[PDB]
Structure 1
Amino acid sequence: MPKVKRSRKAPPDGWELIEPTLDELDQKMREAETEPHEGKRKVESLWPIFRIHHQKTRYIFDLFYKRKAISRELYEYCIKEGYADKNLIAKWKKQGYENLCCLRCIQTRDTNFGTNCICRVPKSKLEVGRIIECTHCGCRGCS
Structure 2
Amino acid sequence: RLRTSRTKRPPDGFDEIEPTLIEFQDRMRQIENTMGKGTKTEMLAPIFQLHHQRSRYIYDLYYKREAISTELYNWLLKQNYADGNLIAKWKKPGYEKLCCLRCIQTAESKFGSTCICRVPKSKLDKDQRVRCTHCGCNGCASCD
TM-score (norm 1): 0.90
User: Are residue 120 (structure 1) and residue 118 (structure 2) matched?
Assistant: yes
Residue from 38, 62, 65 that aligns with 2:63: 65
Query: What does 1:54-133 align with in structure 2 at a 5 Å threshold?
Result: 54-128=52-126, 130-133=128-131
- 1:48 is paired with a residue of what secondary structure? helix
CA distance in structure 1 between the aligned counterparts of 2:31 and 2:47, rounded to whole angstroms: 7
- Contact 1:88-1:103 within 8 A present in 2 as well: yes
- RMSD over aligned CA atoms reads 1.7
Deviation at 1:129, TM superposition (A): 5.2
Deviation of 1:138 (Å): 1.2
- How many residues matched? 140
Moved segments of 4+, more than 3 Å = none
Query: Identity, % of aligned pairs?
Result: 58
* Equivalent residue for 1:44, pick from 32, 36, 42: 42
Check whether the contact 1:134–1:140 (CA below 8 A) recurs between aligned residues. yes
CA distance in 1, matches of 2:37, 2:60: 36
Unaligned runs of at least 5 residues, structure 1 = none
Structure 1 residue 104 displacement after superposition: 0.9
1:20–1:107: structure 2 CA closer, same or farther, 3 Å change rule? same
Q: 1:12 — aligned with what?
A: 11
Contact 1:5 1:81 survives alignment (8 Å)? no
Q: Deviation at 1:134?
A: 1.1
Deviation sequence 1:18-59 (CA, Å, 0-9, x none): 1111110111111011112x2432221111001100000000
Cα separation, partners in 2 of 1:135 and 1:24, compared to 1, 3 Å: same
Q: How far apart in 1 are the matches of 2:132 and 2:61?
A: 28
What is the deviation of 1:131? 3.2
* Aligned equivalents of 2:2, 2:9: Cα separation in 1: 13
CA distance in 2, matches of 1:27, 1:48: 13
